[PDB]
From a paper:
The LP2179 gene of Lactobacillus plantarum, a lactic acid-producing bacterium found in human saliva and intestinal flora, encodes a protein with a molecular weight of 12.6 kDa (residues 1–113) and a calculated isoelectric point of 8.9. A remote structural similarity to two other uncharacterized protein families specific to the Bacillus genus (PF08868 and PF08968), as well as to prokaryotic S-adenosylmethionine decarboxylases, is consistent with a role in amino-acid metabolism. Genomic neighborhood analysis of LP2179 supports this functional assignment, which might also then be extended to PF08868 and PF08968.
The final model includes 114 residues (i.e. the residual Gly0 from the expression tag followed by residues 1–113 of LP2179), one glycerol molecule, one chloride ion and 195 water molecules in the asymmetric unit. The Ramachandran plot produced by MolProbity shows that 98.2% and 100% of the residues are in favored and in favored and additionally allowed regions, respectively. LP2179 forms a single domain composed of two antiparallel β-­sheets packed against a long C-terminal helix H3. A second helix, H1, links strand β2 from the first β-sheet (order 127), which is assembled from the two N-terminal and the C-terminal β-strands, to the second β-sheet (order 3456) and packs parallel to H3. Analysis of the crystallographic packing of LP2179 using the PISA server and analytical size-exclusion chromatography in combination with static light scattering indicate that a monomer is the likely quaternary form. The H2 helix, which is absent in both YugN-like and DUF1885 homologs, might constitute an additional difference, but owing to its short size (one helical turn) and its involvement in crystal contacts (Asp88–Arg107′ and Phe85–Arg107′) it might not represent a biologically relevant conformation of this region in solution. Among these TBP-like variants, LP2179 is unique in that the N- and C-terminal β-strands are combined to form an additional β-sheet that is situated between the central β-sheet and helix H3. In LP2179, a strand is added at both the N- and C-termini, while YugN-like homologs contain an extra β-strand at the N-terminus (topology β2-α-β4-α) and PF08968 homologs contain an additional β-strand at the C-terminus that follows a circular permutation of the core fold (topology α-β4-α-β2). Although the catalytic residues (Ser and Glu) of the AdoMetDC proenzyme are not conserved in LP2179 and YugN-like or Pfam08968 homologs, sequence alignment reveals the conservation of charged and aromatic residue clusters between LP2179 and YugN-like homologs.
Residue numbers in the entry: 0 to 113
Write the structure that this text describes.
Amino acid sequence: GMAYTTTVKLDGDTKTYTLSPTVKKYTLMDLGFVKGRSGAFSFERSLDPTSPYQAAFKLKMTVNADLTGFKMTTVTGNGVQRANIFKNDAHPEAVEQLRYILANFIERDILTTD
Ligand SMILES: [Cl-]
């Protein structure tokens, strides 16, 4: 199917992220991804909380078990509702934190961008 992709553009973003064609299981693990029983790898981080477990947003990413496609989204602190952290630059602290997190993935051959 088409739900896992090789590129993702977060809601509102001007950048697109691409899954590295050379992404490695052990590197995913080293960056904090957890492999589920299905073989897929997941990662989640809170963004810009006001108090413990009161995040403004969360970043979620899953890589498929075959290591050839991914999903990545921003949601609100409830972990479900789609969020747009970029529109009108209304959430700069969340964007800085997101970029910091993803910069590590760029440096370790997980994601690229244009
Ligand atoms: Cl499909």
